[PDB]
Design a protein around this ligand. Structure first.
Ligand SMILES: [Ca+2]
Ligand SMILES: [Ca+2]
Lengths: 49, 39, 49, 39
C-alpha cells in the first residue's frame, strides 16, 4: 500500500499520520525527527596564517 | 439438562441446548468448551 | 428448522476484487439454536459459505 | 472460558475476554487483576 504525507521540519514535534485503507482498520503512524544536519560542499581557495 | 432427544445440554448451572451435530465438531459451540472435551 | 424473523443485512466491507472481498453481517432473532442454509438470489454476488 | 484464540480469559466466575497483548503490560485490565500476576 502506497501512502504520502508531509511532515514539518522541526526537531521534536510529534507528527502522526493516519492511513485509511479499505478492508482494514485505520492505522496511525507516529514519526518525528530527532536531529538534522545541513552540509555545504566546500572548495578550498587558500590557507592563511 | 433434560432437553430434546435431537439435541443435548451443555451446561449444569446454565441451560443451553445444542444439536448433537455440534458435539465434537472442532469448534466450541458453548460458553464452556465441553463440546470438544474427551472426544 | 429454527424460525427466523426480522432479518437485517448490513455490509461491513466491500471491495470488488477477484476473491471474496466483501463482508456482510445478519441480525436476527431465533427461537432455538440450529443450522440454517444461506443463499443469494442474484448472480451479482456469490456467497462463500 | 475458551474464548477467541487471540484473547485470553481473566476470571472464573465472570466472562470478560482480553487481547493477549494486554497480558503483563504493567497496568490492570480485569477486575480480578491477574493480567499482572506471575510475570
Ligand atoms: Ca462443538
Ligand atoms: Ca494488563
Amino acid at each position: 500500500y502506497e501512502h504520502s504525507t508531509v511532515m514539518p521540519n522541526v526537531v521534536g514535534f510529534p507528527y502522526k499520520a493516519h492511513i485509511e485503507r479499505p478492508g482494514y482498520s485505520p492505522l496511525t503512524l507516529q514519526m518525528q525527527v530527532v536531529e538534522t544536519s545541513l552540509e555545504p560542499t566546500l572548495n578550498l581557495e587558500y590557507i592563511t596564517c | 439438562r433434560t432437553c430434546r432427544i435431537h439435541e443435548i445440554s451443555c451446561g449444569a448451572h446454565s441451560t443451553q441446548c445444542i444439536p448433537v451435530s455440534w458435539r465434537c465438531d472442532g469448534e466450541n459451540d458453548c460458553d464452556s468448551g465441553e463440546d470438544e472435551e474427551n472426544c | 428448522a429454527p424460525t427466523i424473523i426480522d432479518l437485517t443485512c448490513t455490509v461491513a466491507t466491500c471491495t470488488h476484487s477477484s476473491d471474496f472481498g466483501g463482508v456482510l453481517t445478519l441480525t436476527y432473532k431465533t427461537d432455538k439454536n440450529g443450522d440454517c442454509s444461506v443463499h443469494s438470489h442474484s448472480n451479482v454476488a456469490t456467497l462463500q459459505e
